[PDB]
Amino acid sequence: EVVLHEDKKYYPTAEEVYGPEVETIVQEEDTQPLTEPIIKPVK
Amino acid sequence: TRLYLKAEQERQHNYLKDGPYITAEEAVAVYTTTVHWLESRRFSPIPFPPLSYKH
Amino acid sequence: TMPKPQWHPPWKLYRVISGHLGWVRCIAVEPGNQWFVTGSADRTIKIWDLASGKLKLSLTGHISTVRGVIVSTRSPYLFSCGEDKQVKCWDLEYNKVIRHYHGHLSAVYGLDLHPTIDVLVTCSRDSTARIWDVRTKASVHTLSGHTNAVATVRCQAAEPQIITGSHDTTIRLWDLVAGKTRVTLTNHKKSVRAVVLHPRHYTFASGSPDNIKQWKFPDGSFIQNLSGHNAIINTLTVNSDGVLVSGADNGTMHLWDWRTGYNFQRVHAAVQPGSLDSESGIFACAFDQSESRLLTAEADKTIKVYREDDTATEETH
Amino acid sequence: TAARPTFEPARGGRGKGEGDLSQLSKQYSSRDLPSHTKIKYRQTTQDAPEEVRNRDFRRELEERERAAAREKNRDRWDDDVVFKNCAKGVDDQKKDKRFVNDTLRSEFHKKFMEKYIK
16 A cells, blocks of 8 residues: 555545536647637638 | 756655555565575675785 | 615536646636637636637737736737737737737736727836727827826726726726826725726726725716725626626635625635645636626636526525 | 845836827837738628627527537556566556646656656
């Protein structure tokens, strides 16, 4: 029952602090690259 | 280098806090395997460097 | 019991968006509820899908902390400001900066778009507001007269067209045409860091750590005084149903009635897992155009999204 | 002394555009040239304010919320060796799902310090 240093879980889970009703969305890198635009021109 | 030493102080503290990781059964396994290997090869253990060592 | 307030349903969290690498200092909603912007301390403006809570686009270009972000309702534009001293205009058609508005001396803290003239009005730490022409990138006027940093600005089409609170505890109601002060409201004891305009009733409120004050627009008449939420409040926002929201630097957020000023809900939300107990704090909040979501921009580098509770009355004072 | 903080900033209103345009200076930068001299306006399909006025936003938002929630739901020999199978039930242990608000303890930082220090 030894926990290695590489594991070492600090900081309890986001599902455990907000609960089952709050849906946590970790958003890193993104859909639609920077050439694909916001509001489209009239083509 | 400063961020590395922050992580390294963290790691040394966690080693002194969380015990060995080595799990003494496993260390006895490692030690016993090394003992059986050294006795299998008839290894002669290195002495202290003698007072009249010619080399 | 002098008034009886309207019954407002309680608000509850349902979504915690995460992904900024700095304090989220501003937020704004697009006019068609398709997406919302945030600006943050990690020098990125992030476009988020409003319905799904998913990162739509990440725009870079500020050299320092992004302080304000607003979306234009008339033109297909995105205005932003930073601690960079810079005021940018983003063409959303191209996702590229096309215009920078130059002339502020220190960090730009806020901005508001005039709703009908194409005029941008910014505040800075240099104790001035400025009035920019969007098309010619020129300072029309320099609203000077505050003595400390200037925290916030709101614009109208009706009279006083420009309203600002500042860190010298005063509020100045200005004339956009002349460029001079019309009313000085000194009622607050600490720095006015939030003002909010009502959609219908031709009043405005303003917030500071002592208490929040409501006010009639032409000459700043005192109407009321809403107290109980005692922390450094960063933003105020209003729902057309008369819900005032007052969020503060301790992370607390109190939900108020506009008309009577009754505190019906206190939401002291929990921080993100890695976050620190002293890092709870709100910097910005916005209603969506449906006015049924509440977007808060938190000091634990998250966005929190709230909605009204469909479990009816459990309430009434 | 020489090395000192500020404790008061500079106040705007006394230079180049501030009161009389520095008494109408004939000095101008390259960045002050005519550029983007035409405001674009929102068209009928973009989000023009006439198109945004009649709309009921809550119903459309609830529809988009419903579709997004439905999409997220529909997505998801030498037997004589001194150590047996040590990794028995370790199914990769989802550290790469957690987001942690600590720059020394993010999974990004652990990968960073593992990758760039030898």
